[PDB]
Design a protein around this ligand. Structure first.
Ligand SMILES: [Zn+2]
Ligand SMILES: [Zn+2]
Ligand SMILES: [Zn+2]
Ligand SMILES: [Zn+2]
Lengths: 56, 147, 53, 66, 56, 56, 53, 49, 49, 279, 44
């Protein structure tokens, strides 16, 4: 459906991120935060992104 | 007694059939996050801590522990803890005084109510202040108990 | 303190009791489970002889 | 543990009788069933307690606290 | 399957059960503790004003 | 819960001595002997839900 | 308390010692009593002493 | 010939202690080829138990 | 009064199990509240639902 | 802006309001008024009951190994392909030094407190022209000694040099610059139990050693150029006060110390017997 | 009188570092001195 589904939309170019209510810092409740999994992965993504673009 | 229930004599309960003790312990110790100055086992008063509970800390003593032999209700705290951080601008910023608490006290389990028995403290493997208490409860048979 | 035996077995003086009536079952308030004889298979009451058979 | 005071079933005081029931079996060499009989416990609800109670208290007691 | 189709709820209780031949079928016996924890709102009418006043 | 029963409604008589309490006849639809089983309670919160609960 | 025996044992086993009660009618209940906190005219006081001699 | 045998001591002591405390039967490498319930906590409710 | 049928009677050995009702009674109305899914939390000890 | 919220009862307003937390209800109430303020509190202890980033820094650590639901050849492929970003960050050097000090501290069977303190000491400076290389041995040994000393675990320089020889000079300069750095950013009695542990003696000679060390510290006779030596001969005169054969000829190589210094301390305490014995 | 430590009735009366390894004993576990405060019971 051209208004909702396009094969060129089916390739990732610009990636949304979800707000912290999806991926909350658990606030580890002894002294620390222990901040969580999805945000770790997003930090990885942005690191590899800047590495690729500087290398390019 | 239909479907495996039982009728049980009250008088035998009163005399002491099937009575029982109950021993529970707790474990807590100071933690070092330093810049080696650790937590403390003190008695938190009102203008030292943040968001501390309503456990009515009166049962503790000057060294931050409870004494053996006293009774404890459900919500009484037994251990006093205080945050040694630094760096938090620990009594000069983002809090009033309310000195440096961020209180990490350990309340008793919310239901049972025993008597504190045989509290000891000794250092852990590496050397800290490391505390074990024990509380003792009588458990008379009631309706729902299972034999 | 004072106390009575109704709310605790501390305050009892009773400690045991005994009770029996019609040891010969003339009133027929029971009949005996048995397999050959009621008379043979049950022991006589100790209070039998204070009333006639 | 000690002997119980006051048999759960009946209520008769028991606990005076314990060390007596012991020395009925130490020097008097007496059979224990007759020992309880001569101790005078003719119902059996009372009798079970002295016959089956174990004495863990001295096994506790052989420590050295304080 | 664990947050939409089924979930935790509120206003609930959980004990063990025993028989009773002095309750007819539509009745259930509840401990006073449970009935002190649980609750149920009522809207104040002319009809129940005094009873709710007393009960407050 | 497996079939249409085991969600059935009840009126409440408050009783002392904490445990639930129910009539012996309703035992087999619940499929629950008193060997240590446990039930669940669910308090309705409004007039519609109270009414349809009582009427169904 | 120091002994190996536990405190509520000591309480419960104390609670079961029978006591002399010929003159029980002379005094009155602690609940009905005009006093508070165990006057002599509603209660009696007992004391125990032990030693590992 | 001396300094590394002490961290060696840490390795084998840590390995045995970890295996017995956890129950996974393998070194500290997220439990390959291993079994789970090998070192349960002693049950002490009753002498018979 | 006498019962009609005579009954069985005697001593027998029991033991008391650990599943006591005081640890299984639990109720909650409007308590604490989870963070990731915004639901009533778990835990009978933790005053869950 | 500052975006900040302070709770305030809109019907009492008499203070920064004296309110309480009803944690079992997840609500906050103006305790003087009784009206609820906000509802559905979020947990604060079960999240901890459910289960070091600061030492490892802002960059996030990753212990990556092999799994279970994949082939062994693919795990080997994972290990070969996971090493493609070990040069962009300085965190590679940070956990390299962390691994090195982990090896050194746990080889010295030190507490986790000492390990974390050394981690902190390295992390605090971690990059300066004042560091200037020094073969990493100077800075690692200095950070370990500073952390272990500030955890009040005093260890001897001979033992530090036996574990890692840093020729006793660059080690000293590095200790001074760490002292200065920590000074800008801002225990001899503890040595004795380790030595009597290495000699195997009961508590009373230890207590006697503490008393004699404090008393000889109080009066005079620094006498020895790092008087750990006369601290040791305090134990030597204690064991001469008792009658257990712990001869100085044995003691010298037991503690890697000079026997002539032992006899000199024996002499300087021979003329100073007066006030060193308690009972 | 604040700590016990042992089979010895060493009333340490501890403030800080007065030979926690008590003098008559050699223990170092420091047990903690049941109170003098008056306690209540209920022999129901
Ligand atoms: Zn009896
Ligand atoms: Zn009175
Ligand atoms: Zn208000
Ligand atoms: Zn001692």
């Amino acid at each position: 459906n051209e208004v909702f589904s396009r094969p060129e939309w089916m390739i990732l170019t610009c990636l949304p991120v979800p707000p912290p209510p999806v991926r909350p810092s658990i606030s580890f409740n002894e002294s620390q935060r222990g901040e969580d999994d999805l945000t770790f992965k997003l930090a990885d993504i942005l690191k590899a992104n800047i590495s690729l673009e500087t290398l390019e | 007694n239909q479907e495996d229930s039982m009728i049980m004599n009250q008088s035998s309960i009163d005399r002491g059939l099937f009575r029982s003790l109950f021993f529970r312990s707790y474990m807590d110790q100071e933690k070092k996050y330093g810049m080696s100055i650790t937590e403390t086992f003190e008695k938190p008063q009102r203008t030292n801590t943040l968001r501390m509970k309503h456990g009515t800390y009166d049962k503790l003593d000057d060294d931050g522990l409870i004494a053996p032999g006293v009774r404890v209700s459900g919500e009484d705290v037994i251990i006093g803890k205080t945050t040694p951080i630094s760096p938090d601008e620990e009594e000069l910023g983002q809090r009033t005084a309310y000195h440096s608490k961020r209180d990490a006290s350990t309340p008793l389990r919310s239901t049972e109510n025993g008597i504190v028995d045989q509290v000891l403290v000794t250092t852990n493997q590496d050397g800290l202040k490391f505390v074990k208490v024990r509380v003792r409860t009588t458990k008379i048979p009631q309706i729902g108990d299972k034999f | 303190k004072k106390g009575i035996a109704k709310e605790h077995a501390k305050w009892g003086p009773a400690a045991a009791i005994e009770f029996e009536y019609d040891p010969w079952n003339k009133l027929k308030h029971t009949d005996y489970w048995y397999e050959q004889d009621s008379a043979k298979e049950w022991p006589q009451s100790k209070n039998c002889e204070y009333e006639d058979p | 543990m000690i002997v119980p005071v006051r048999c759960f079933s009946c209520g008769k005081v028991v606990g005076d009788k314990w060390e007596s029931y012991l020395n009925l079996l130490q020097e008097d060499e007496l059979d224990e069933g007759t020992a309880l009989s001569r101790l005078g416990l003719k119902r059996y609800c009372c009798r079970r307690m002295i016959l089956t109670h174990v004495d863990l208290i001295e096994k506790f007691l052989r420590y050295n606290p304080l | 399957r664990g947050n939409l189709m089924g979930k935790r709820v509120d206003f609930s209780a959980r004990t063990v059960i025993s028989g009773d031949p002095n309750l007819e079928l539509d009745q259930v016996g509840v401990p006073k503790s449970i009935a002190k924890t649980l609750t149920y709102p009522e809207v104040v009418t002319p009809y129940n004003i005094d009873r709710l006043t007393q009960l407050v | 819960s497996l079939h249409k029963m085991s969600m059935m409604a009840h009126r409440v008589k408050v009783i002392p001595y904490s445990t639930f309490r129910l009539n012996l006849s309703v035992t087999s639809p619940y499929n629950a002997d008193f060997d240590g089983d446990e039930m669940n309670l669910h308090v309705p919160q409004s007039e519609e839900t109270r009414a349809e609960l009582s009427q169904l | 308390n120091t002994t190996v025996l536990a405190d509520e044992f000591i309480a419960h086993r104390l609670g079961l010692i029978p006591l002399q009660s010929m003159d029980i009618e002379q005094l009155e209940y602690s609940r009905d009593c005009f006093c508070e906190d165990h006057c002599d005219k509603c209660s009696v006081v007992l004391t125990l002493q032990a030693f590992g001699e | 010939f001396n300094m590394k045998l002490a961290i060696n001591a840490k390795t084998i002591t840590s390995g045995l202690k970890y295996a017995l405390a956890t129950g996974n039967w393998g070194e500290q490498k997220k439990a390959m080829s291993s079994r789970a319930g090998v070192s349960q906590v002693l049950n002490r409710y009753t002498y018979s138990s | 009064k006498k019962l009609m049928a005579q009954i069985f009677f005697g001593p027998t050995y029991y033991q008391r199990l650990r599943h006591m009702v005081d640890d299984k009674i639990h109720a909650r109305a409007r308590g604490p509240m989870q963070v990731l899914t915004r639901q009533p939390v778990e835990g009978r000890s933790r005053d869950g639902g | 802006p500052n975006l900040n919220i302070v709770l305030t009862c809109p019907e009492c307003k008499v203070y920064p309001p004296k309110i309480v937390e009803r944690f079992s209800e997840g609500d906050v109430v103006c305790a003087l008024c009784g009206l609820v303020l906000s509802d559905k509190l979020v947990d604060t202890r079960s999240e901890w009951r459910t289960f070091n980033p600061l030492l490892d820094g802002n960059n996030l650590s990753t212990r990556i190994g092999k799994g279970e639901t994949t082939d062994m050849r693919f795990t080997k492929e994972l290990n070969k392909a996971q090493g493609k970003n070990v040069m962009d960050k300085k965190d590679n050097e940070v956990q390299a030094a962390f691994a090195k000090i982990t090896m050194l501290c746990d080889a010295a069977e030190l507490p986790k407190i000492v390990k974390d303190c050394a981690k902190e000491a390295y992390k605090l400076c971690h990059d300066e022209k004042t560091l200037k290389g020094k073969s990493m041995e100077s800075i690692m040994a200095a950070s370990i000694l500073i952390g272990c000393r500030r955890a009040e675990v005093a260890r001897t320089f001979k033992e530090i040099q036996s574990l890692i020889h840093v020729k006793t000079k660059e080690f000293g300069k590095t200790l001074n610059i760490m002292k200065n750095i920590l000074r800008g950013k801002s225990q001899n009695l503890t040595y004795i139990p380790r030595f009597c542990s290495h000699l195997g003696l009961p508590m009373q000679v230890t207590t006697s050693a503490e008393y004699t060390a404090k008393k000889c510290k109080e009066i005079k006779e620094i006498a020895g150029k790092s008087p750990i030596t006369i601290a040791v001969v305090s134990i030597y005169l204690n064991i001469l006060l008792f009658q257990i054969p712990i001869t100085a000829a044995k003691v010298g190589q037991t503690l890697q110390v000079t026997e002539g210094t032992i006899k000199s301390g024996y002499k300087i305490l021979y003329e100073h017997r007066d006030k060193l014995v308690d009972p | 009188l604040k700590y016990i430590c042992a089979e010895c009735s060493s009333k340490l009366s501890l403030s800080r570092t007065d030979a926690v390894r008590c003098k008559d004993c050699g223990h170092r576990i420091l047990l903690k001195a049941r109170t003098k405060r008056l306690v209540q019971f209920e022999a129901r």
